[PDB]
């Protein structure tokens, strides 16, 4: 299973009637390119080291699409304002997700192409890739025009072709380790909580990618009630952290065990509290 995505955003400003436009391309959930209009000199840029080798003719081409999209978002942003009847005098947000999922047979599983306006789903291309699903009374307008104009056929092309083909190039030239996985280094701190009780907190750190699972056990029986945790968080060096905690009576901490599950681990980790 591999995948490609371009995540596009445009936010319309009051007065200065250029919106900020931002686009970021992911390969297997890794940022590999970026375009940000607000930047002093706009241009798609490489955002992982393995992209540098694409010649200049690639970056210009790419960059013109961006300026293309910038405009389409400029205009679509207006069009919408009319549908919803809102003020030229307030900030509005429109986003797009597009790309392909491949399966480990490098066959095409699914292509996506959808949009959000003001943080609510607006229109999405269905899995058939010939029809639209539309929320608002307003996004039906966008739908009819798209059905009439043959919008779907265009996107289907991108999806079943370029997006597949280029995701392969990026995935053979991205041989240069997109493989990177840094395994977690886990440990259990100990924190007295109440009279007769303590918290044991299992930490997973310095791991990449961000998927990981933590569990706590009491003599083989996984814990689900009384498990506190946090959402996975960037350490700020490209890796992630997470922890999970349970409360446990004083003196019995050594027969609770923490398990950590991550790809790039040879086996699943097992640990308990010990100074």
């Amino acid at each position: 299973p591999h995948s490609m995505r371009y995540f596009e955003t445009a936010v319309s400003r009051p007065g200065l009637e250029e919106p900020r436009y931002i686009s970021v391309g992911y390969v297997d959930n890794k940022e590999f390119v970026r375009f940000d209009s607000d930047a002093e000199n706009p241009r798609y840029e490489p955002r992982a080291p393995w992209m540098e080798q694409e010649g200049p003719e690639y970056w210009e081409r790419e960059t013109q699409k961006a300026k293309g999209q910038e405009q389409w978002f400029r205009v679509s942003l207006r069009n919408l304002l009319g549908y919803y009847n809102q003020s030229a005098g307030g900030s509005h947000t429109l986003q797009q997700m597009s790309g392909c999922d491949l399966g480990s047979d490098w066959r095409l599983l699914r292509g996506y192409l959808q949009f959000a306006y003001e943080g609510r789903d607006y229109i999405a291309l269905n899995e058939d890739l010939k029809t639209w699903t539309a929320a608002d009374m307003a996004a039906q307008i966008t739908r009819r025009k798209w059905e009439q104009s043959g919008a779907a056929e265009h996107y289907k092309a991108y999806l079943e072709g370029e997006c597949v083909e280029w995701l392969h190039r990026y995935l053979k030239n991205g041989n240069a380790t997109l493989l990177r996985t840094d395994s977690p280094k886990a440990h259990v701190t100990h924190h007295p909580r109440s009279k007769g009780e303590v918290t044991l907190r299992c930490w997973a750190l310095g791991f990449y990618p961000a998927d990981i699972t933590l569990t706590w056990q009491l003599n083989g029986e996984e814990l689900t009630q009384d498990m506190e945790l946090v959402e996975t968080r960037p350490a700020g060096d490209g890796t992630f952290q997470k922890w999970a905690s349970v409360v446990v009576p004083l003196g019995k901490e050594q027969n609770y065990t923490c398990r950590v599950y991550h790809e790039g681990l040879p086996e699943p980790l097992t640990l308990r509290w010990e100074p």
Binding site: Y6, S23, G25, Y44, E62, K65, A66, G68, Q69, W72, V75, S76, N79, L80, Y83, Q96, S98, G99, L113, F115, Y122, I123, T142, K145, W146, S149, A151, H154, Y155, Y158, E162, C163, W166
Partner: peptide, 9 residues
């Protein structure tokens, strides 16, 4: 390579 949109909304 990124998609380029067709008809606007």
């Amino acid at each position: 390579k990124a998609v380029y949109n067709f008809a606007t909304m």
